[PDB]
Amino acid sequence: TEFDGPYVITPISGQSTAYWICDNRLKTTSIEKLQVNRPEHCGDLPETKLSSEIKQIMPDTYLGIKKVVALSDVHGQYDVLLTLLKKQKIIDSDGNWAFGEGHMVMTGDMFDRGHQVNEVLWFMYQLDQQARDAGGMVHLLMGNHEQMVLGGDLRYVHQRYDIATTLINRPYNKLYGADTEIGQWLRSKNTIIKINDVLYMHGGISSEWISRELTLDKANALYRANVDASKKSLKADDLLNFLFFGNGPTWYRGYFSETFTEAELDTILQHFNVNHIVVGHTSQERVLGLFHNKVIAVDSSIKVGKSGELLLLENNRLIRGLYDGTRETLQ
Ligand SMILES: [Zn+2]
Numbered sequence: 071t072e073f074d075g076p077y078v079i080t081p082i083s084g085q086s087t088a089y090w091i092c093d094n095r096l097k098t099t100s101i102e103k104l105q106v107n108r109p110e111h112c113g114d115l116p117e118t119k120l121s122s123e124i125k126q127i128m129p130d131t132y133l134g135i136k137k138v139v140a141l142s143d144v145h146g147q148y149d150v151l152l153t154l155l156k157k158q159k160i161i162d163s164d165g166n167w168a169f170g171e172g173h174m175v176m177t178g179d180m181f182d183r184g185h186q187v188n189e190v191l192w193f194m195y196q197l198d199q200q201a202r203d204a205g206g207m208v209h210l211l212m213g214n215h216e217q218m219v220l221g222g223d224l225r226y227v228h229q230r231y232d233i234a235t236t237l238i239n240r241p242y243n244k245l246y247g248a249d250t251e252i253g254q255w256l257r258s259k260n261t262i263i264k265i266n267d268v269l270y271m272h273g274g275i276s277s278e279w280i281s282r283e284l285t286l287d288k289a290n291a292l293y294r295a296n297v298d299a300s301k302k303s304l305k306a307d308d309l310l311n312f313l314f315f316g317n318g319p320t321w322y323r324g325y326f327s328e329t330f331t332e333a334e335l336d337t338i339l340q341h342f343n344v345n346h347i348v349v350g351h352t353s354q355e356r357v358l359g360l361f362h363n364k365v366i367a368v369d370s371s372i373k374v375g376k377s378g379e380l381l382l383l384e385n386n387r388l389i390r391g392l393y394d395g396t397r398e399t400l401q
């Protein structure tokens with residue numbers, strides 16, 4: 071049988087309510103002053119204190135950040151994420167943020183394929199709040215699977231979540247709908263950000279972005295306002311169509327094409343006045359650089375459920391952080 075959740079409903083006024091799947095049955099609890107507490111007989115599903123701060127919209131451009139860590143495409147593999155962050159000493163063994171005033175960029179795709187999606191989400195919500203408390207930040211970016219799940223494209227959701235949708239009687243997209251805590255938190259997030267001289271997004275930026283004279287702020291605001299729209303309306307708008315489909319920031323795989331050129335990459339770098347672009351989405355066997363490290367791939371195949379790696383940007387170095395805790399300088 072399954073243990074899964076919580077799924078928290080947070081109304082515009084009043085207390086929230088938590089839904090728990092416990093031994094393939096539903097338990098529902100009223101939340102008392104922001105403490106999300108697990109009912110009896112329900113495994114050790116995560117408990118969280120709700121936070122309003124981390125659902126506030128934050129800037130998408132940052133200056134002077136001394137150290138950054140980036141990783142991506144966890145795809146519901148909590149055990150792997152936790153071990154990697156423990157090995158690399160980003161968290162303490164208790165799982166609490168230990169990275170000080172550093173910034174973490176998770177470049178999308180927390181959802182789908184894996185069987186520990188809510189463990190990943192509540193862990194990242196906790197880390198988001200703890201980072202802020204320490205003067206640092208977690209940037210949870212939206213990947214193509216965040217967009218798919220929130221929008222109702224449920225092709226890649228693990229079978230186990232059929233228990234939650236049946237018992238709670240909501241389709242999976244509405245288990246993360248706008249009246250849910252996690253759905254509100256996600257709807258506050260950015261899709262493309264810039265930290266120092268590095269640009270971060272899930273898939274990559276195509277030359278079409280330039281043609282369309284887009285900006286970070288305009289794209290991130292449109293992503294927030296439309297992640298809820300139908301495919302037909304997305305399809306219908308020329309710019310939303312670009313943003314949400316295959317040549318856009320969350321699906322583009324062009325940097326990984328054997329025909330893509332450094333020349334074209336250089337025009338993108340020049341456009342954004344950056345020296346590097348950090349992307350997930352296209353899975354690699356390790357964190358690696360392309361084009362003389364102008365692109366760093368940080369989808370390290372955590373989705374396979376065995377291991378993963380991260381990128382550290384600190385002291386003007388680019389460092390590969392391995393699953394065993396070791397480090398190798400990329401640049
Ligand atoms: Zn992915």
Ligand SMILES: [Zn+2]
Nearest residue numbers: 179213214351
């Ligand atoms: Zn992806």
